Nucleic acid binder design. Structure first.
Lengths: 67, 144, 77, 182, 191
RNA sequence: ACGAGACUCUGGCAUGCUAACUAGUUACGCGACCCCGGUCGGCGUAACUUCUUAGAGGGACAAGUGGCGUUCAGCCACCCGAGAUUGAGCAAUAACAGGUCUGUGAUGCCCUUAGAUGUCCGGGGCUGCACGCGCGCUACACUGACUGGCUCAGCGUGUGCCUACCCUACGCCGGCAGGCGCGGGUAACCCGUUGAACCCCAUUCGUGAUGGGGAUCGGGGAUUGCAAUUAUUCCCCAUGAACGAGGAAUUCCCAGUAAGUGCGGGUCAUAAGCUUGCGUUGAUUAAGUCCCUGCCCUUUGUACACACCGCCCGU
């Protein structure tokens, strides 16, 4: 590692279907606040709403499927 | 008061047994075999000794009065239904036993049953339960 | 993984009394649990000492309950 | 009375340690580092073996010591991440020998401490600093610079009395080194 | 005169939330401010109606566990009030601010999911929903105080008191912070 | 056409309707205590259904609004609103070598019928213990134990045909388990305003197999019954064992729900650690999935059809 990634917080725009083996994960469409043009997909555990802002430890990965 | 008094006796040697002095006097005397929680309150109520003191600071005259209440409890107006050993088959007297009369009299009663050959004595000799309960599912620590 | 079986004193010796009288009114939160932990004494003995200090007037009452009581020091001003 | 073995409070990364396992949890497992004053550690479930396991207590064996390598440590917070998969088979004999020398040095110094009757944490750390850590820093080896020093000082009293700890305690330590290390 | 909803003797105003991700999930400010941490009910009926519950009421409801304590709401309420007494007399800080800053500091922000068959050890890194952040934070605070107050001379009114302030300053001498950062370490270890 | 739905019972509301000395409320008088005003489930009687009882009717239907949908069946959120998914009952064709001949004077065949497998009396047994398994109860404590005081319910049941055995206020005696003359109820009237438990408050205890835990065991006293011994049950004093939150594995549940806590009914001469109901306190998590264990429909494959727990090749 030897690198401190700055924490970025992102707000969802649309909730997708629930992924995972047991259906416990959820696909969401988050967007960044320092520049409101970028939209990526992340895997979340737990219930989420529309307009719910999430904290992200990293902002580089993309969402994988149930496997 | 709350400071430790002089000649504060720690270990109390009473009736050839070991008694702690750090416990409450209503509970430190309960370590003697034969006496329990309920009869301890009556003894310290007949004697003029309060229940708010530990056993480690009492002295010879009050513990001697308590030992007299131990050995002869009948004429200090302790009621007859409060005793553990009543209406004896040997002599018919009401008495309170303190571990020596208790142990040897329990032993003598068990050998009396084993000599008389009652089924209670045979069950005590075999090492089983006497009060008439189920042995099929319990008592698994009997023998290997 | 040391056991360290506690053997709390049933009454005060010499050093515990003045250690209490110099340090307990100089602490923020006083309860019989933290007095028994810091001064290695019994719980009821700490309650009796705190009742004595309350009767002396060097400790103010905050709240009383059948489970635990809350005590604090005097204002230094 | 107990303290750490070497002068370091927490070990560095890529360092081998022998650790005592205590309990097994869901995400990891609680252990105790016997040479670092039984501090809290963590071994990962996926790091226990490189292949598929059939039970947790195939490789748990609660109560028996094991060899691990420190992967990530946190000196300011007191957290050490341990690793079981990344160990060589040739390291076990050297780790066992190092732990043998460290444990016989700790036992000899504990015996000398209870002879000298010095029961305090800071005083015991001072006795370690005046007894073993000085020669460890002199020989620049964390563990290999001590047992050779007692082996030389069993025959060389001038080398034994180089540390200015005390006189009667130095004589008691020399007597213990002469009687035990033969 | 209802000038201010004083929480027994503490004021529900002038309390600062530092995180913006937990702004609409913690309700203590000016609308959901009660005199007691005990309300009526119909709060766990729909999906997100528990986000409108007061945070001290959620802590009181999660205080009771392990068989012999279920249903005893009055006893947990007086534990909460006594714990607020030690929190106010111990730091000089308002006790509602200590509750807010501990939950933010003890929230696990990244999680690992069990994936594969039964027995295989595979974890996939996901992030934690903000409601689940508060939920596991309250659960962690409650279980830390619960296992602190077990076979110990120290009462639960004091064991709960030391558990939040160690979570408020992030000293990591508390048990909630311990599971929080080992969970973050496990989620960081395999991503 | 059956099944689902439709239908019935119960809960959730209606200050509108009908009604109450076997249910009360509000006013009035008398009486009692205190400092001019408060309390009375104290006494008695002028209206009333606000509490209670239970009868008829009403009310919620995707009814409205904004979206999605072929703008069709329907779905989502919100407002007014006691409820915008309460719980149970009934429950189709086909078959099981499922259980019951020990529910029956329901029953075919077989056996037996006076030294009886019918019947009756007396005693014993179904409880007997190297051990294993299932359903349950109490705990491993200080969110606690003991001791005082404060304080709150709902389902129920009650003098029986041969059949004798009911529920109980009140007075005395006795520590208590209990005992005697006394009164009510064949029941919204009497137990009864069912002063229930958990909780609440105030002392004692202080991390100690301890004042936790009450197994085992000794002595004594009452009740039921013709009869208790292999202690029916209850009470009193002693006796104070294992047990320090439990391996592999596995059960139940998502709202007044789990769980804690007690009260009724069934067995009952004596009687609940079981079961069926009832009430109090009252949560954590989730509004999803087919990964595990299985179920429903379509397509495909089969050397199976007593149907994969099938069939089958060779030494």
């Amino acid at each position: 590692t030897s690198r401190v990634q700055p924490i970025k917080l992102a707000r969802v725009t649309k909730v997708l279907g629930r992924t995972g083996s047991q259906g416990q994960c959820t696909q969401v469409r988050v967007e960044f606040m320092d520049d409101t043009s970028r939209s990526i997909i992340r895997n979340v555990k737990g219930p989420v709403r529309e307009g719910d802002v999430l904290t992200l430890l990293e902002s580089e990965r993309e969402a994988r499927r149930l496997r | 008061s709350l400071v430790i008094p002089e000649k504060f006796q720690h270990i109390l040697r009473v009736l050839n047994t070991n008694i702690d002095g750090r416990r409450k006097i209503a509970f430190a005397i309960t370590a003697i075999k034969g006496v329990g929680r309920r009869y301890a309150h009556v003894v310290l109520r007949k004697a003029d000794i309060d229940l708010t003191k530990r056993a480690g600071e009492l002295t010879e005259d009050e513990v001697e009065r308590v030992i007299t209440i131990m050995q002869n409890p009948r004429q200090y107006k302790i009621p007859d239904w409060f005793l553990n050993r009543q209406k004896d088959v040997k002599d018919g007297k009401y008495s309170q036993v303190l571990a020596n009369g208790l142990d040897n009299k329990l032993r003598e009663d068990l050998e009396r049953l084993k000599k008389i050959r009652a089924h209670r004595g045979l069950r005590h000799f075999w090492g089983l339960r006497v009060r008439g309960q189920h042995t099929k599912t319990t008592g698994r620590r009997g023998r290997t | 993984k040391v056991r360290d079986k506690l053997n709390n004193l049933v009454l005060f010796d010499k050093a515990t009394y003045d250690k209490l009288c110099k340090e307990v009114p100089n602490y923020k939160l006083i309860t019989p649990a933290v007095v028994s932990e810091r001064l290695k004494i019994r719980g009821s003995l700490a309650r009796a000492a705190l009742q004595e200090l309350l009767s002396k007037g060097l400790i103010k009452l905050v709240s009383k309950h059948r489970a635990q009581v809350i005590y604090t020091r005097n204002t230094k001003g | 009375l107990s303290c750490r073995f070497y002068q370091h409070k927490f070990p560095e990364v890529e360092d081998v340690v022998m650790v005592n396992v205590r309990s097994i949890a869901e995400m990891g497992a609680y252990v105790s580092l016997l040479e670092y004053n039984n501090i809290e550690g963590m071994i990962l479930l996926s790091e226990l073996s490189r292949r598929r396991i059939r039970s947790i207590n195939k490789l748990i064996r609660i109560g028996r010591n094991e060899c691990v390598v420190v992967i990530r440590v946190d000196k300011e917070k007191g957290y050490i991440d341990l690793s079981k998969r990344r160990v060589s088979p040739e390291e076990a004999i050297k780790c066992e020998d190092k732990f043998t020398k460290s444990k016989t040095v700790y036992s000899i110094l504990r015996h000398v401490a209870e002879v000298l009757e010095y029961t305090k944490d800071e005083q015991l750390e001072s006795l370690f600093q005046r007894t073993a850590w000085v020669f460890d820093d002199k020989y620049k080896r964390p563990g290999y610079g001590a047992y050779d020093a007692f082996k030389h000082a069993v025959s060389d009293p001038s080398i034994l009395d180089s540390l200015d700890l005390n006189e009667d305690e130095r004589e008691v330590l020399i007597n213990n080194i002469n009687r035990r290390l033969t | 005169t209802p000038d201010i909803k004083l929480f027994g003797k503490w004021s529900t105003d002038d309390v600062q939330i530092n995180d913006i991700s937990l702004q609409d999930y913690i309700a203590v400010k000016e609308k959901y401010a009660k005199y007691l941490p005990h309300s009526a009910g119909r709060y766990a009926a729909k999906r997100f109606r528990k986000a409108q519950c007061p945070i001290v009421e959620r802590l009181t409801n999660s205080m009771m566990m392990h068989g012999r304590n279920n249903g005893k709401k009055l006893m947990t309420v007086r534990i909460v009030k006594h714990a607020f007494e030690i929190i106010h007399l111990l730091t000089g800080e308002n006790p509602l601010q200590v509750l807010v800053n501990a939950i933010i500091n003890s929230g696990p922000r990244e999680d690992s999911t069990r994936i594969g068959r039964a027995g295989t050890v595979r974890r996939q890194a996901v992030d934690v929903s903000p409601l689940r952040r508060v939920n596991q934070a309250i659960w962690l605070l409650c279980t830390g105080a619960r296992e602190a107050a077990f076979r110990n001379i120290k009462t639960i009114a004091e064991c709960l008191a030391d558990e939040l302030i160690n979570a408020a300053k992030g000293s990591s001498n508390s048990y909630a912070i311990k599971k929080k950062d080992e969970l973050e370490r496990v989620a960081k270890s395999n991503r």
